[model samples]
Target chain A: AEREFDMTIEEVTIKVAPGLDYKVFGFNGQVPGPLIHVQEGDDVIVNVTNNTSLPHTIHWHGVHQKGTWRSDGVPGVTQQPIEAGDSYTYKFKADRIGTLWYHCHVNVNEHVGVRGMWGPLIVDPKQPLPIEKRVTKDVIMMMSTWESAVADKYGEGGTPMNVADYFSVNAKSFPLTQPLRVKKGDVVKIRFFGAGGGIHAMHSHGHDMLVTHKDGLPLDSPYYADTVLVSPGERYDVIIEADNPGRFIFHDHVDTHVTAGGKHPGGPITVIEYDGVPVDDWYVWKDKDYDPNFFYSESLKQGYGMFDHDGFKGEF
Target chain B: AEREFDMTIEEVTIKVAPGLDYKVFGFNGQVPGPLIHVQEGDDVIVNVTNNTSLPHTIHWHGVHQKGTWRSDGVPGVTQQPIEAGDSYTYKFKADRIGTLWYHCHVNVNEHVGVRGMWGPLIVDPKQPLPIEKRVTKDVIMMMSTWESAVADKYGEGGTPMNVADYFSVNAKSFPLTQPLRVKKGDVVKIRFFGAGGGIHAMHSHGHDMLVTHKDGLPLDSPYYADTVLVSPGERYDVIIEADNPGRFIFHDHVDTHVTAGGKHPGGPITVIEYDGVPVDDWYVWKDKDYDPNFFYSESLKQGYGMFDHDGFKGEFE
Candidate 1:
């Protein structure tokens, strides 16, 4: 069997924080491109149309582009770049089963790091492990960093500076970042992706995460940890039993990373809000607009190629 | 039976890199202090003498310090600092087994981070694993950082800046760092200690390390990895099967960290040289002086405390 999808790359502006707007080359007009989920051994075909002025190619990271190396999407290595106003069909098999990703392989430091040219590509195993089978709520948290001066220019600077002014999840900083909502007794699975230049140590306040996978492969000895470090180009899948039901903070442990543009409690910060917890009057998220399908968990279950959400909104 | 050890804290000067001398607060006149290896369940008694101008405390990093909380070594919480010219005794049971460490708990940013004030504390499990019994060599690699200005002032500036000018393994940068030598069929165990503010991703060039312990506790599920990230205050124990015979580079994967004082190929880098491999003419370590017991694997087997070595030698030292 085969799964087919179509994506278009376009230059657009998205809100990174309350008062900041960033110009990005997004897939399908969104920063995170789109979510492509499939079953193991399925032939995955993606028709990508490059509408941006710059040439681009989609690299199916973690997918073994075996035999069909042209579909692996290296600009000059495997094949030529998908030129501007051109379309390329990437035909390959979903050879691995685990959390994977897709991103532009041209000028990676500029495109994938600063210009928001990345998204999730999840491949489900044919036989889920007992621990994996118990997971009820699934979530994807893609971490990235941005520089206002560089991003405002659509990453025109040949290579981005090593320094980042702001860090984000799903392309938005805290106060604008969505929460991972769960109910009591729910088993939560959070797939962490380090898609930026900075290294992050994800720490959970109350619960310990059972680390079961690394780089999209099962760990022979799964361990429990409160804090797990993820460097660039690494992925870790952790399971949390939502037994201690309270609003707990789950964010990066690096002191410099918790701040947004040098402001406290800003970057890559979010809450694991239980179903019935009341937000205090002084809570930062007291009046935050709620979106049930913000993470596309439902859309993923429905086998949708792309998802639309109202998460990128903030009052002017 | 109880094993007793004496440690004296004194201000000393040591070479961090070529032509660089850092004033540090170390135990018994050396940067990494000493190696304290004990058996599990032994009553370990440490008599510490503080001779530095400032006060200090010794925090047993991985020990439970149960009931003897007063000796846990956190100043203002467990007990007062061992004031200058004063002495204190830390007696605690070796509650856990694996790689552990001890460092100053007073003004940690200055005492522990910038100044050299740490040492390795290894506790062997009563019953060794079959894999562990096959180990032919044991090495302790303590990772740390230094700021030239702060060290020049003897850690005077309060709360040293987070920026580190140099990174070191066993208090020495590359070209000065010692390599881990092994035979073709040896099982080498390398214990990594992250005693600095910056996190490190230790990558091995050839062989994969079987990560067996975390924070000194045996992992329920040990895994194999080419790179392992160790944050400040964390420790990891890895087992390497020396089946491949070659001289391979093992260094920090963080690109900036491989440099010393902004120069490439300088910091926190070393090699795992198999016994029979020959050094190339252009290799940096071709004419380097070799020390067989630099890492104290032999002293560890001899059950010695704080064995001295010729590792601190240089033109000035």
Candidate 2:
């Protein structure tokens, strides 16, 4: 029962970037989804209920279902789609250990999966690695996009309708996306996931990360990269040491993906500030008490709750 | 002089879709540029010069400039790019070709060829094939796109343009592209090229084409296909026999490529018109007297020969 997880597909309007509000299918009411943590060989049953108008099945991405191929959750291939409003239980042995995720395997992954029907499913190893090999801090960076145009146009076919206007990390655009705080000598492990069709070239401003794993499997020989590319359905785990800490940014090298609605310093961007590092607290203050439902029905009106922007900019 | 082709890169604004215009780099003042026809074993010297503000090079899309490695232009590889205001002559034998093209192998091909600096180069065999294999009417269909948003904000790159607002074939959006007029029993061969970074799955209505070649190379076992996929830097040659005499449309199967400025039946959609076939002439008539420079400086004005679409509606009235 400890490894059991459940998520209901819910359609909602969420504020992606500060100015751009978009309605999309989500899990458990918000994007970035709920996190599922389990240990190796643990029996896990994830009950996914389709609460929306469409049918959805969660494919445990990068997890080898092994003997549980029936619970592989691939609709049409392994089993029928969990009908709309119906629930399906995906029972599988959490045999694979490492960072992975779950998303709907439907409609080019555009319907529910692309909308935020994905979340972290971290499976621990039989035993923890060496203490020195362990990380002091763990962060999951999930990359996704919001297809606002396609949301309005049903099967209007193509154009940029399928293309994303608002790109985000952990479901919210930058400036509002809180910076990951760390200590001076902390070993930071970042598990990167590209859940959308678009590619995200993750790069940091000051230091490089040693790529420990590719596609959720550890590399035999580690290599350093300041920028790493993550295509759709791919997962990468990299480790960074906060030896050279300052108010620095880590952004997608793909210039367009880094912009919000074509504006500079917008999409999927965030800061990595070490302890005691100088940062404008007001901008930090502006991002507090974020309403995940801010985009729902003008819930962002002045008194209704909004993002405060006073003293948000930082210069050092 | 007989086997030589010269095309200078030109900077111009052209209409990509109806009422939509953009400034782009072009060759010979047009996109999917001029067609170059030469017989096999003929020595061809394609004298190319850069006229735009950016650097560019002409990569013979599917032709192997055999033994002429220097002439096989590839920026940072075969040779340095032809700098703006500079010129270079590519001297090589038109050794092998059926359907091939030339584009700038630079900037992921954004600066020059994608806008319009590409042209079809067809080399006939030393001995023509049998009459059954011979084509009576030939058409070159090139698939491409317009990155206006990406163009306006240069160097902001990641996975094609975020918005291909204008998609096209032979550089003209649909309802404006002329139909391929054909007679019954005519062996119509279509040369397909994916010039832009976008992928196009070209399908013809009603008839299946025998795919004779792939990327300018003849296939041993020719297969019939209603749709052919052409990715960027790839070419295909397919022949259709106009036996079933009727007006049919040939279009990109990819939905995005079929729309222009986000409007359906707008981009990369053209027709195969059999002799005197009955079809709507207004949409067809809306495609006549094309000016390659119509998108430049209100060059689409009356005296400047513009696209006439006073009757077209954005939606059902």
Candidate 3:
């Protein structure tokens, strides 16, 4: 059977919070771009256009091009940058495939533009996937982004480059972003991508995820991994059978990244809220007349005279 | 013998570079505000007043304040922040001193003011009669700074911080910053301080410097060190005999810090210019006769047809 889909690079406007709007690069103007799902042996032709002013090139991260180096899209090494107002046709046959992605390898600063550029390129093997159950919903989680505050400083009159402030999942900070849902006994496959210059030690709260693929190639034998270090320009494909049910979090293990930018529960963090009858007071702070944005000035203030002498003691 | 000096904290306007004016909280409104030199066992009292809107405190880095933790001046840790419009009196004996410094340890984001907050806290030991014929001038080369782009963003928004950018030796980048002048046979002792999160891998160009002190205490035995890694909140006193009469650079050897921000050399990067006949083509980019600023762009343009590659081969032009 043959399948066809049209994918376009377009601008995506996202409201990160109530007042913060981020314009990001996206495929068809959607966050995580568009999901290209295809079976093996399918000829994939993606017409990628550079809609923005800056140059752009797409690296089909994790897919072997099979000697078609032109389709690699590594600017200057393999080909020239697809200049602004220009489009390139990426034609290749889906040979070895699992979960893959495409992003601009050009100016990473400009590439970080809100909804600027990204999408999923999934190539399913012709053979039936060996599993007791199949995934009901497929999700692609891309980590790594430069905060605008830091970027603007460099772009203005400050330095020319800046470090990433915080990493996020699906372009939203924690507690404000929605969670991934799953029923008990359902096997969920997640595609993880690290696109910037940091490491993410991904640890899930409740269950361990099996390492099914490194980059986009399926492992000869899958290994179980709950916490995995995902570095820059790397990808990890994981599968977890939702055995236990409760609100659980998948977060980075780096203590600083978990608390950076004064944002509690710093990113790349998300929850797997299982549907079950509540038995604890988990909803007390989040619901029931509690405000998430409440600022307790007394508890939040730093420096002297706020606490009693007996209440505070040095800890070595 | 007694020596008295009056110091005042005032809001001063300083020009870091041309057209860039920073409101610095200074001791007498001068960057690298007035140096305080005294003998050991002398009574030192400083009236530090907060002139900025934000609260500030001064921590005497690398100084042993026995029984004077209250005078230590670490805001929030030791005492309350000296609020705006309030003055604090720090009186202590210049005890066990060599070369020391003081800076505001309040909100690290406001450390741009710290550039003006720092000055020499020299307490010459009581029994220094060992005479050396080669010794000449005692140069105090203090490191200066600016906040990193990343830290500045978080700081401006009232967030926690880390440092990114560093300036040293009277606000100069290497090869452009003035060189220290010394005679060929003079002995030079440099007291170096790394006051922030950045590290300095200081290496002398022509001769090796002897590591005399680490964190203000004399080393077990003074060892010859060509490169010293001085971390934040630490100091190293290095002594170099200017035997070789040539222009030699001392800089941080960390490759990224050396050239990360567009080929600009970073903190504590300075040169010792010897009194000798000037050699031809001694400066950088002399072989090609091109300006040093254009060397990076010219070389990069030849390789990638652009100056800004963005870490990719084709993103340049």
Candidate 4:
């Protein structure tokens, strides 16, 4: 069990929605480039550092770098490409557990699809699956996409006629996407991730998910969907028992991904809210101002690893 | 045990992909416009007509139509719009058992997302599920999407800035998508519908589907996925235990839906073929031209109801 961290990519900008700012390549500047949770024989090590001149490499996706296969971040088959102001590290072996991720295999459609790089590499499970041991809100939600005519253009990446028109979950979108807040019997796990390049079906109006896990392991049977379909580098995880609370909507049923750059309400949607639920003034983030650790859930209950919402401005 | 179907709704053109013709509006004209298959308290009835000048409405989609709520077709609210040549009937009461569909409901983003309308209803369940009495190939596969610059532009409808650019399953695409063959322990069921507006995911390559059923019932647990994800009206049935033997590719993992109007290999791909598996020449449909009931799987084992693949040219009576 050895973890070690230290990442950094650079070039931020922020405010992914209200007034839209953009300009990505985050990681230390944040756009889902942190939460590296560990367990199941750790050894992670990271130490990235590229500071923007470009060439980067992370690729831990679903681990299994077994003999460490040059830290499995293929630039030209397994190594080299930390260049441009260099610095590498990597290390591996959190092998298989569930819901893994890490991105930027160098120019991956402009560094992990549209330049935000990526994150969330969870690995828990040294034994935990009596339905993830009654979870009470674990939430990771990644999902991504953006190219409203070059989602705020930058180091130039996406192109297949680039059209995704904004959609997100952790990188924010949809009236700013946040809110999961449960209480009524709170089980709520919700680990999604697909990290970029479209294909989300994700629905959940009143509540039904229950899917117990898929790319993050555990799931011999567990099923119960109110719509769930996260493509592009998958990861399912579901669970939500929250008893059918109040302020619904957990969207992205793909009607052009709940529209935004194409008008109407907007993409990647959120909100589960059910702790006495009573907010009016037509409540759309009722005069909002949230971020009780937007989704670090108190830095995953204080075992705080590396989250960087500090740049998202909520404190380190 | 009633049943009776008539349907009609005209206007065709055919050859969707492969020099691509497409004009569509069909029903009795085809493009997945038939297959009703009943049981579970039957009664059904249909009738339709509409020879097309616009105005149509079918909408059975998972049928319940309870008190027959004007046959639940929804034009203004389950009633009118069989107009422009008119005629309607509908009935209903197969009262839920699984995998349902039927579409039009007037201008639904242009008659069920890009004309050609829709079909496939299948109710059955007086008692089947022992994993559906070990199904021996039931296949219905519908999925769709076209907008290749106004996918042949007709009576105009889709707009959200339309840009799907062709993708299909039963309507064709992907080296003209077809092949399912199977034979190494064949449990094969594959029902998936999502009549299109895009959001497929699908996948499959080697095997693993077993989704059992959803939006069509069953599934108290049933999982195993190699991909799945349907969406847009939704239907998902899955169940291919063909016990690995060779030849794969099930398609639509959304990489621009495999590509077509955008290039690359092309959308809604198909092929499972495990029989003896040896079609060389880099086997892209290995010289093609095969359609022993292109997924009507022998007119759903010859109970035959309407299925105008006749326009798709295969015979009607």
Candidate 5:
């Protein structure tokens, strides 16, 4: 078939979590912009309007850009940066099949992706593969980190080196990243895209993810792992057989990334709550003093963000 | 074939880097302990003498304790922690052929492994493979982090929230984690073991490593990565081809990890110096006033150490 997506790049403020506001350069005013899923060999035209004041260029990562190397979008190389308030139409063939993404190529990586100007692109193979190759409940995790300030703990010269205080999944932190609800035996496909300079070792506590794809390509002999280290510019496609029930939690194994504002109960953390179980324990909103910052304090054992805080287990 | 290795888990204080001394619980008085290489299917006997004041357990991570379940080394579950000044013999068949490691299972992961009780283990398959399978220069990097204190930035119970100030490769921080000297076309195999709770995403500035193994098991399909994140309890074996000559700088990509006592070039920063190239540009050690502390100082914008500092990098920069 054919595929075309109209997207506007806007510098908007998003209430990533309740009472938490983040200023972001987003797509359609959302963190991950939009997912453009196209079949292989389809003509793809992405219309992007630069709604920001700074010049920006959207690099269709993983796309060959083919004969239109100019559309390759490395602002300094392929073409000039897309000017402020300018409209750019990127027309190309979705010639490849796999999980890829798009983000601004004008400025630095730390400033762009984490600020939320990125989205996933999956150009599927025209003739669909077998049942084992498809997903029932797809969980798209755009793993990223954010900060009130732009910092790379490791800097050249004398730059104020600071680490990211906020960890996010699809632009929101935990309790906000949302969980993947499924029934027993549901084929849960997690399309993971790691962003920013920091890495998230995407690991599950109760299940093993048989990784079938890496960077949009198939793994010849599938290997199994409970923990997977997903880094920037990499995409991992893994299948979680919801074989067992209960609140099966999965988070970044690097441990530190599972914190927000220097606190725990943050980062890319959630669970696969199988249908046979009770949602009674997870009805988190019932608690009047449900502070993610509070749990993070109790757990992280140190840091900022101490507020009045917890029959807390069900909060998520 | 039968195989065995005798190692002493000693406690020592060594100058890990310039102007810095780290008190560590090491094996054979070294940060990386030692490498024990054995062929697959061999009956392996490992004798370890504990020479530290504290109790420790050497858990063979990733190995199936199997019929030798008692030798698993899990203190509470398998047996009591080996007390100070004691010896233990762990005998088992090297049934699996892959990259695995041995380290203290007692104490929190942050203190035990990072403080040094760790080393690399390699089990080769019974059948000898082709020459291509053997690396010309094998380098083992035990990536770790250290703080003057033991802290887990994320501890649920009574665990303290702490971040490491010093990062090291093989117990030595950078300018200290010596660069591997290799010639063009050299197949350099890097066996990486991540120590402590903190993870290190080893990224190479100049070359891409073709990853061949994960946790010791051979990868079905070897993929190339410029950066590979090695997490605690995990091992990665990658082969780097010295295709491109010049300096191939490799360091942690997790940003904060590339720090030492709150300074850059202090962590696991090093290069693969290709032979034949003049070492002039990198003769950084020749600086008479070479502040190993300068890389940690601000304004190195001018290049190479020359410093007297403040604003600690560990002050959570």
Candidate 6:
């Protein structure tokens, strides 16, 4: 049995920061695109139409493509890139039953704009088991980019405008993104895929998670892992048995990434609300008093004092 | 009441990396020498004897000197380096109370001998509490020294060694270093000072640590953190509550630093052992199903793949 879906890729121009406007090639006008779910053994065909003035290709971060090497979408390695105004049909049999993802594998500059070139390729396990054991609810979090500044010494367009300042999950930042829903006792799996050029230490507060798969393949033996490091172009499939959850954070462990203005307001962050009573006395109001500027500046101020000594005077 | 400690800064010959050697002016013939614990307001005098062939000076990483700017160790910034065979006395009062450290502020070659030139200068809080809340038992760990052949090529001889193969915690590697003993309920704080050229992502397995202090001062508000990225000449004080009792690993989170046989095995690595587990379980034994060759082969194989794909494998190697 197989299912077919049609997705339109578009060119979107937006402001990442105030006065800093840029364009990105995305799916359905969404950077990091949308989520597509399928079953194991299901055949999938995606007609990727390039709506931008750049060539693009998509590489599935962790999924193992059995015999579909040509459709692997690596620009030079597998096949020629899909040029501007070109349409490439990416057809493949979803063999592996796990959390998988696809992203642009073209030039770094052009790849940054194809926000819609990424999505989730979920292949449900062939055999149906207990509903409680299966992933009832799922959220596809793809940490992607928003570059602000270009290096001056390198000249305009010389140095690609790529210094990712805004990191996102599902193309949304904190307070702007939707919260992941889960019930008490339901096992929640957050398949983290880092599509851009930075490392993300994905972590969740309150509960420990079992890291079942790395790059789409089952771990030699699955073990409990709270913080899983998802590097650039890397994917990690982690499942949390939502036992005692209030509003818990799922964020990048880099610490600075999750803070709002400098504090951990849970920006580019999401929560896991549970049905049961809160377990820990300390786990109250999971999101509050997030000042991003103060959060980072304070750490930097201390860091300056630690290294510079009397070389510079304390300002704050 | 204040205590005064005297450390003789003497020059010593140290084999930094095999084939690459340098004589370092260290304290009492030991690189990073012994742990020096003093209280806030304690006056300390260090008589530094430059026994090495080149000039040397000692720079305290994060100590505030009220009027003793002359004793500040930057070679051209403050004072001239103490010439070889000459000795200079450095006297200062410990004003701050936190994890502070000392290192050579002279040439790059001497700094690479961090093993002998660095050590912890702990200033006890002004008022000693009944029980130190964070520190169940404190141990001094300094990341120092990498193989010379690899480090020398990066111009680290006269400049900061930009690349390193090993990162050390108290100069011992994992499975070999003594574990930090703790009970099930104690809160243990490991103050990490990166006195070298490379950056380290200090991470611990099984438990998340709360970073209480960064570079000696308390964070605005303590937050739970599992890993702290400590840059060169930086320090981070992290407190981990030993709630989960098991053989857990604490090492540099940088994937390359975590792998074995890259550089020095005695890089920053150690274990947090609970009261009752056998020490044998904490380390990988050769007698077990563990295949040493496969472990070594897989890492090399991955390196080859990364190299072939990236086309600059030779650059790092």
Among the numbered candidates, top TM-score falls to 1
lDDT (10s digit) by residue, model 3, range B1-317 = 34444455566555443323345566555555455666688766777776656677877775677777788988777889888878888767778667777777777545532344665566666765243223455665555555434321313421245344444443334433445667767777677766544545565544556677776667655655455566666778778887655445455544334332433333445555555625344343123222321112122213211122111111101
Instruction: State each candidate's clash count.
Output: 1, 1, 11, 4, 6, 29
DockQ of each two-chain model: 0.07, 0.05, 0.02, 0.04, 0.07, 0.03
In order, the Cα lDDT scores of the candidates are 0.78, 0.64, 0.55, 0.74, 0.63, 0.54
Model 4 is docked with a DockQ of: 0.04
Deviation of model 2 at A240, angstroms: 1.0
True contacts kept of each: 0.04, 0.09, 0.01, 0.08, 0.11, 0.00
Number of the predicted model whose lDDT against the real structure is largest: 1
Which 10 consecutive residues of model 5 chain B have the lowest summed lDDT? B308-317
Tell me the spans in candidate 2 whose CA falls farther than 4 Å from its real position.
Answer: A112-114, A127-132, A150-159, A262-265, A279-316, B1-317
Task: Say which prediction, candidate 1 or candidate 4, comes out ahead on lDDT.
Answer: 1
* lDDT of residue B236 for candidate 5: 84
lDDT of 1 by residue, A1-316 (tens): 6888889888888888766688888888787777888888889889999988888999776775544555767553345789999999999888777888888866665677678888888888888878998999888888887776665675353121245778887888888887888999999888988776568889998899999988667898788999988875567999999999889998988888877767877888889999898878987788778766666666567763555444532222
TM-scores for chain A, candidates in order?
Answer: 0.95, 0.84, 0.77, 0.37, 0.83, 0.73
Candidate 6 residues lying further than 4 Å off, grouped into runs, are A1-316, B1-25, B108-116, B128-131, B144-147, B150-162, B260-267, B279-317
Interface RMSD of each: 8.7, 15.8, 17.3, 13.3, 8.2, 15.5
Model 2, CA-based lDDT: 0.64
Put down candidate 2 lDDT per residue, A1-316, tens digits, no spaces: 2456676777766667777765556667666565666678878887888877777777775555544555655443356778879998888777666777776654433453245666666776776545325686677788877665654433332245555677788777886676766778988788888765456899988889998765555555667999987755557778888898787788777878777776777788877767786557664433355433221212212221112221121111
Which order, best to worst by TM-score?
1, 5, 2, 6, 3, 4
> Using DockQ as the measure, what is the rank order of every candidate, best first?
5, 1, 2, 4, 6, 3
- Against the true structure, what is model 5's DockQ? 0.07
**Which structure is stronger by TM-score: 4 or 5?**
5
Give per-model TM-scores. 0.63, 0.50, 0.45, 0.34, 0.57, 0.47
**Which stretches in model 5 have alpha-carbon errors above 4 Å?**
A16-20, A127-134, A150-162, A278-316, B1-142, B149-192, B197-213, B216-218, B221-229, B237-317
Per-residue accuracy of model 6 over B247-302 as CA lDDT, tens digit each: 55455644334323343233455555466544442244322332221111122223
lDDT of 6: 0.54
DockQ of candidate model 1:
0.07
